[PDB]
Amino acid sequence: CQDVVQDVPNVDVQMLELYDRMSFKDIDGGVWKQGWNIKYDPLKYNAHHKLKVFVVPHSHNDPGWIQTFEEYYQHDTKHILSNALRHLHDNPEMKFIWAEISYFARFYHDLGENKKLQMKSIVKNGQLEFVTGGWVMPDEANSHWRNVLLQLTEGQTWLKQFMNVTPTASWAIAPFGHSPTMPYILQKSGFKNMLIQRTHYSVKKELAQQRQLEFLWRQIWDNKGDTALFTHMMPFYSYDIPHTCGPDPKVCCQFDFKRMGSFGLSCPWKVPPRTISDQNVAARSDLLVDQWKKKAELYRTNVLLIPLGDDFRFKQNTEWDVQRVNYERLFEHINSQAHFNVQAQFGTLQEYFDAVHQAERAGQAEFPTLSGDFFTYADRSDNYWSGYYTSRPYHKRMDRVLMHYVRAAEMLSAWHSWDGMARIEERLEQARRELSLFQHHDGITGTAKTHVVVDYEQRMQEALKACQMVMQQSVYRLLTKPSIYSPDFSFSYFTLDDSRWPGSGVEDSRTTIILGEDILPSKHVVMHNTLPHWREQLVDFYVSSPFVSVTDLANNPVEAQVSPVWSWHHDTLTKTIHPQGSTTKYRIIFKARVPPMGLATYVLTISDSKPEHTSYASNLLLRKNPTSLPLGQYPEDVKFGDPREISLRVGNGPTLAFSEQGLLKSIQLTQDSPHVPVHFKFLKYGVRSHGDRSGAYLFLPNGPASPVELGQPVVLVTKGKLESSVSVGLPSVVHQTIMRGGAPEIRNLVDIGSLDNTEIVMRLETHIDSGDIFYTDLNGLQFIKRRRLDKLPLQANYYPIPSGMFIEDANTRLTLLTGQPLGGSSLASGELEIMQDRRLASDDERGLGQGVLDNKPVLHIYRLVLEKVNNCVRPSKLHPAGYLTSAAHKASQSLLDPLDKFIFAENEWIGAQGQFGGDHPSAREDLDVSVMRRLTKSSAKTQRVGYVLHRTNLMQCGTPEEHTQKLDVCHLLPNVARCERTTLTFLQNLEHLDGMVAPEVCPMETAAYVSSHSS
Ligand SMILES: CO[C@@H]1O[C@H](CO[C@H]2O[C@H](CS[C@H]3O[C@H](CO)[C@@H](O)[C@H](O)[C@@H]3O)[C@@H](O)[C@H](O)[C@@H]2O)[C@@H](O)[C@H](O[C@H]2O[C@H](CO)[C@@H](O)[C@H](O)[C@@H]2O[C@@H]2O[C@H](CO)[C@@H](O)[C@H](O)[C@H]2NC(C)=O)[C@@H]1O
Ligand SMILES: [Zn+2]
């Protein structure tokens, strides 16, 4: 295994180092506004060394943005694909590339068989080439790597099945900044090449000046380079035709033949395209070849890529003709005039990369190595695209909920083959596709129109229902005695109970377990643990009595705590935000212990008075002018007091101190240790009253944030043996700190209400001497070192926080883990901050044509981990990565993949069993079974199950390692007949494994395996 900690890779370009040295001055470069006037030597190309130009026609099709997926499909994309089929069929030299398989599958499945065959033929002969082949072209900032892989797999499995092709070149012209998680996943999925476009204009200029726009992109920890993937970065401001032929858009626009007027388009530089004729072709060719040769000066080979496309292009038949005929005329003239020393043709992306590597192999070029990321993007001026790290945070959180529900549904249902009448494959395909669609760079990013966000939400809601159906049918099958099992595949044997989605104040979706002497004495509940290690976690349920006790299914009592059900209300008469308790519903909490990838059953039973193994939390309401708070049968009366500082400790865990406003002020890790200052604060950013306005994409604050004026908020303290909490009703945020004996959990119910032109930030202030350094993750996969740069504006120092961030000094680290991607930074030494929501009245001039005024309450969840790290073996000062500790990694897992909770829906479960998976291996804590998916339907004689196995890297801090069991996923199901290592999409076999044993993987590596079983 490569060491991912102690060896600093040697790369030609390391983006953090480049950032430290780069000036970022925004000077007028001339016609290339963010570059310089490119010069070339005409003598560079000659008879023995021609410039080979590939013009690659393309059409950017957004799967929702300004219109919904279906609206775009009906108005634009079905016509683009129908006319592409016709025109490519009829014009054998014409070419076209296609990226978004969600639309292509949507089209192809509606084609008559003779058109399906025609389509297959133009793909087979190379005229229509798929690039990337994901369901979408995903966002790279907010997306979790697991969902990037899910959508890539959904698109590529469709293409292999129906088109018999698997792209090895990726095309990502539109995400708003780029992540090295993409080459990581793509290189492990068979790819050889990738292309990106939206990188900071200063980076484009710097890399262009060094001809470092094509590079071998390796991961930041990878010393040896086996992760490297050849990457092409486009050099100019846009992927449209004015910015793809060469550096001068006033010239290149004249070669977009859709702009002469009848199509409703024109050239902003005020020189239109002119139809090519014999009379003008020499002059037009001279202008175009000059642009090409300038672009070619920025790259190292004599093979030049010229994309030819824009959004929803190649729609009308007359557009196909006008682009094709004019370019054919240009090519005939240029190719026949030796003085240009150019051979130009339509091509595909794969054609371009193959010719580049042929030139490399011939010794014409060597390419630099690069590591790092390309966040935060700015396309011009100070317009940094950090707003979309937070926009529409309800759906950002929903993404992570559904992420987990899809994993759990696929894993729970994978253990068996299912009859087609159960509709398991149908429901899972729906769930995978709606989650995959939302990875689109206008979906999770929060950059679509309001009605499109509603369409994504509705799709994801249907996907959650599909996951629930599959999970509950699977639990019923896995825990009922086989000779009793008698399923109705349409029935709900269980309902899911989810305490954090949509979340209190977001929606009371939670069912109460109704118990009573004259109706039902007891109820079975079942917990699922998708992680491959034994796990304990407190779980809570709502019950209709406080007098409830818990047993396991050996009838062993389980210690439990009952608390009230508190809900917060904005009281429009007293003008306060305060909690109300239920007098008929209560929360019971207990520790569930669940096998690896397994299930555990418990029983809740009512009794007529306090049970022996159930305790009751106390409750203290801190406010001036209190009023009573009755709680029905709850055995402890609520206490009242004026606001005051308070401190709490659960178990042997940290002691937390709170201000009289209900906000954390310090953490004491042990009885001996110091109370370490850790202060939570809420602040607000506004919008500029002159100049460019923040919108769904851009964050353009009017200066540093200002504190939220808190008034005298009401604070509720609940103190229990198992769980305590401090909750406070602040303006726009019900803020909750929950303690269960280790790192606290923070929940914010964020309702920015009608606060126009406001962004709500949660900041942590500490004494940690972090300086200008902080760490944030990329796609939930890796943590990258960031350096705050005062030479950049505040919004440029914001980065995606897809799952966590930390600061540290020699002795102390503070890590904040998230259950949702949001934007954040460290704007001063010892701070962390993360945006909660943003409400913006204005459009920000990037095409959305609306502000962000559709906010809804969202429950954001976090874990806060303060740790001593002076004993940890950390990377050297020059290393670009950081790594979590075991506690912070487990805390992230507790947010993203909690236990699932099932409530049996009818009165008696006959045949119930107490556990599933007790004989599953409990793997080392840094290993995960990220995916388990049965790949065959029931009629296959040889069943196949795929697994994606990911090992993270945790810091060594001197905790002796607990001997654990080796996990061999190929023996998790019986009767294994073969074990293969595959690409991560499962589509190619890479190794036939000895002994049918799937090896575990190295730290920071991810591997896929498929087990085959005789059935
Ligand atoms: C119509 O207003 C202009 O259009 C441009 C913005 O709309 C353009 O792009 C839209 C985006 S679709 C695409 O990306 C979005 C994210 O933006 C994503 O969510 C979707 O999924 C898609 O993938 C689209 O709706 C339209 O088709 C259109 O292309 C924008 O380029 C332009 O801004 C330039 O022009 C104004 C003047 O009109 C200037 O004031 C700006 O400064 C900017 O000028 C450009 O600056 C760069 C850097 O200096 C130069 O190199 C360019 O040459 C220069 N262009 C021009 C015309 O001067 C407007 O907003
Ligand atoms: Zn797009």
From Swiss-Prot:
Keywords: Disulfide bond, Glycosidase, Golgi apparatus, Hydrolase, Membrane, Metal-binding, Signal-anchor, Transmembrane, Transmembrane helix, Zinc. The keyword Membrane applies. Its main location: Golgi. Signal peptide: none annotated. Its EC number is 3.2.1.114. It comes from the Eukaryota. This is Alpha-mannosidase 2. It comes from Drosophila melanogaster.
